[PDB]
Design a protein around this ligand. Structure first.
Ligand SMILES: C[N+](C)(C)CCCCCCCCCC[N+](C)(C)C
Ligand SMILES: C[N+](C)(C)CCCCCCCCCC[N+](C)(C)C
Ligand SMILES: *[C@@H]1O[C@H](CO)[C@@H](O)[C@H](O)[C@H]1NC(C)=O
Lengths: 540, 536
């Protein structure tokens, strides 16, 4: 047929499809099974390498989304729907995608592996905003985006157990990585320049790979957008993981009656429950009412993660590492409508003070009273402690800083200090297209469109600057991808992006106006969160 | 034959004053008038008993003894330090007051201004050149009274509940002086119905105490608290602490409460002064040995309690603070600070100094403080660190307690006026790094720049006038604003809602909202909870 859309892989033949990007043709190999479907008695189990196949495996289309909760908060609303599954749900979802430029690159092009985010409970490479055709067509890079097990399926764990040891949604990603290694070669990809890049929980994931030895040998560069492995939401202890597994199990009738004491039977029992049964009780295992906290996520097992990601970034050796890190203007905005009284995407959410005080307890569930006070002290504007507008924006700040920004900063600094070559940024441009209210500004995850290059598509209603902007962004990423320096290669155009350093603390303003270097990532505020607050908590 | 204008008859007898010359004219001055029987011998530690009547004409032309106290020998010969030291023979017999009126004495009853001097309750005197009534008297026509009150062990050593050493006597001395004015001030042309109290540091604390003590409250109508409050970390002590110290000091000099006080009364006054500092419990600064005890008598409850639950509708108050309240004190106990160099310190000193400045803090409380006052972008910059250490001490001990008091008073009916003094005396002898320290506003209020003999500038003289106008207008009408003269900058009341105060500097008045708002919420609201959580 066409040697361009026909490829032999370590397991067998494949057939891609030829996509048409604004600037030209692209080869796309969608739905490549990287592992044997983790269904049946394989559920909660580490993934296994897909067995070799006979004939030509079709790969002209997107596979099934892993089993996960579907958002029903705002039915029909693009702002939420855009994140929901666009393919059928199934426990048989272990496939990855590959975009290569048409025709295949002359020599070993650098590879950009994307890891989607969604609180470790949702997400899919199948998504529109994760369309890696532009970054291949335009920047000529080999882009790979895989699907990994979310929710209970990916992270339910009974630490120490043989049949649900946890973190399998990560081993999924790791397995996709080992694949890209021994197989990307055939797509014109360089198995020597693997640059991982993900947002939210994907970012947190990327971090996990950096912190996990076995994952090291599978990548060389890393980008962590709006998320880290060290936060208050990305991991749970062994005890908590268990307490939530058993509880979820219990709710689903596992085991039935007053029988118990055997984890194997407990999992065996769980393995028989319809997928939707688990998803039904996913949210009932949280210990307190909250936001930006997820039920099933990576666990500190002492295997995939040898110790807390905190303890790891604190004492790891990141000398050789080259990382790109960042954040958006208002991380915490999106999460407010999902459980904080007074907040809706429909009104301006001009909240009362009491609403704000309550909100603080939700957004910071692990906080004792005194610690809550501290947070209130810090975020209240005492000249106007009643102004609804402040209270509103302050709530978004508490959430966004606590969960994303400060942890980012804590990582960046701890990384740089450890030997890493870190680069930081603050995405501040609010897409014109954006359907969420003005009050949320630049919400968690609204940088993707630009990094992926969606504004390049003419049909989509993006402004010309946004297009130029997107290209600029794609440039930084791909540049960081090949070189390990997001800067205009040789061609020293103009503004330079300096490495974030402990002493200097430099990050850049990623927006319409050319680069604009700044110092201190909420330095003051994050000193509160990263230095003080912790000891306030470990006292109370 | 006598000058009819300098001969005054007072309840205890007659007295002759002296005609003084102020820059713009003559002024009458009656100095060293006794208002109490000499608190000596067995009268030591005891409350003041009224001055017994005398015969003949008492000589009220010269200042009297300064109350027995400690003398500041830190920087021998240094004006900025000596300007506060005793300028008359020390003696226990020091209970006298001074009145300054225009010359000739005013025809119409004029508003009285009563000055209570600073000095951390361990020192001070009305004898001091900075507390000179002559300018206020001559330029504004005020009747200015100022008294001496016992300090240190003599005026504040307490064995709560005993008869022979009840404590707070120095505060009683001031009250007695306040009564004396009530009675006798009419004789000089003063109006007993328009008494306005004003003080600085411990002086302002004392003023606050009179506001919070019922008896004293019916002896004045308005008040001005300059860089000082009744509430706050240093102004008062528990009854148990007061006793811990008193008992300790007693033991330190070789001494049943009665039998103890008896022994302390045989000790030479200097023996006491020498040991008064040995009783402090911790390595600190801006923390004094013998201050007002909360006896449940003069002070029914704590000033904190009292300002939170009191009626203050019938009160007009002027409160303020100078731009660099902390500096002066760093020099006294925080390593790395000297008047001689620029005192740029290392983060290590800043850290060890916060424990000096907030001696009562727990490691966590301290760390909370450190976190607040650090510039995390340059946590090592000695300049910022130096400036910051000064703010910790100023905010903790003065600025915030003032903001607290302003809010509580305002909240509970009072009419409050607030300011921040920002001008640095051109003639200032303290290093430029100390900015406008604690006490360097006084000389302007009292009108010293009006004396051409002193080397102030023309602007400074004009400034002094403006301030004297502010104070007197307030002492006169409860409002510091120029009445008829709807001039230019109008000074609005501090309200809990708007939180406005003004800038007292060479430029015209400027209104500012929120007095160290965010920082004071840390000290006032949060720090205490954290403090109690981590307490002993
Ligand atoms: C922004 N994306 C999507 C890319 C990543 C964010 C994932 C976190 C979603 C927060 C809302 C959780 C709501 C939980 N429920 C629906 C159960 C209330
Ligand atoms: C300017 N006036 C006279 C109105 C106020 C003077 C206040 C004196 C400050 C002394 C601080 C001592 C601190 C404790 N140690 C002994 C450690 C220095
Ligand atoms: C916004 O709307 C939600 C639900 O419609 C409501 O709970 C909230 O009180 C509203 N807030 C304002 C400020 O209108």
């Amino acid at each position: 047929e066409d040697p361009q859309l026909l490829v032999r892989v370590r397991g067998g033949q494949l057939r891609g499809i030829r996509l048409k990007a604004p600037g030209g043709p692209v080869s796309a190999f969608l739905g490549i099974p990287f592992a044997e479907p983790p269904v049946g008695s394989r559920r909660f189990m580490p993934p296994e390498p897909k067995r070799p196949w006979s004939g030509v495996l079709d790969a002209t289309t997107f596979q099934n989304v892993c089993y996960q909760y579907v958002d029903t908060l705002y039915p029909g609303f693009e702002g939420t729907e855009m994140w929901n599954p666009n393919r059928e749900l199934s426990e048989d979802c272990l496939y990855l995608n590959v975009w290569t430029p048409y025709p295949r690159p002359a020599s070993p092009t650098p590879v950009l592996i994307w890891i989607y985010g969604g609180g470790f409970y949702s997400g899919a490479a199948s998504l529109d905003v994760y369309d890696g055709r532009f970054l291949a067509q335009v920047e000529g890079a080999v882009l790979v985006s895989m699907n990994y097990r979310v929710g209970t399926f990916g992270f339910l764990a009974l630490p120490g157990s043989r049949e649900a040891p946890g973190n399998v949604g990560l081993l999924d990603q790791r397995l996709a990585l080992q694949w890209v290694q021994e197989n990307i070669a055939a797509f014109g990809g360089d198995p020597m320049s693997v640059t991982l890049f993900g947002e939210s929980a994907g970012a947190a994931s990327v971090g996990m790979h950096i912190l996990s030895l076995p994952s090291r040998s599978l990548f060389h560069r890393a980008v962590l957008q709006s998320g880290t492995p060290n936060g208050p939401w990305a991991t749970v202890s062994a005890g908590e993981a268990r307490r939530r597994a058993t509880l979820l199990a219990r709710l689903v009738g596992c085991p039935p009656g007053g029988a118990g004491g055997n984890d194997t039977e407990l999992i065996a029992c769980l393995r028989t429950r319809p997928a939707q049964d688990l998803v039904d009780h996913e949210w009932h295992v949280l210990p307190q009412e909250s936001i930006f906290r997820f039920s099933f996520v990576p666990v500190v097992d002492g295997d995939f993660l040898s110790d807390t990601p905190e303890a790891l970034i604190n004492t790891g050796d990141f000398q050789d590492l080259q990382v790109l890190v960042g954040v958006v203007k208002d991380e915490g905005s999106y999460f407010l409508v999902y459980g904080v009284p007074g907040f809706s995407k429909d009104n301006e959410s001009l909240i009362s003070r009491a609403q704000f005080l309550a909100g603080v307890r939700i957004g910071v569930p692990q906080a004792s009273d005194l610690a809550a006070e501290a947070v209130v002290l810090h975020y209240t504007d005492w000249l106007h402690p009643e102004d609804p507008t402040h209270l509103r924006d302050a709530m978004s700040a508490v959430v966004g800083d606590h969960n994303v920004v400060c942890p980012v900063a804590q990582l960046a600094g701890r990384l740089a200090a450890q030997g890493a070559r870190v680069y930081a940024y603050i995405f501040e441009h609010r897409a014109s297209t954006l359907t969420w209210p003005l009050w949320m500004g630049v919400p968690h995850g609204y940088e993707i469109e630009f990094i992926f290059g969606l504004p390049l598509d003419p049909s989509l209603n993006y402004t010309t600057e946004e297009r130029i902007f997107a290209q600029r962004l794609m440039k930084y990423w791909t540049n960081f991808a090949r070189t390990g320096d997001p800067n205009d290669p040789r061609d020293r155009k103009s503004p330079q992006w300096p490495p974030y350093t402990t002493a200097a603390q430099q990050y850049v303003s990623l927006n319409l106006k050319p680069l604009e270097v700044r110092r201190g990532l909420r330095a003051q505020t994050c000193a509160f969160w990263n230095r003080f607050l912790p000891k306030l908590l470990s006292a109370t």
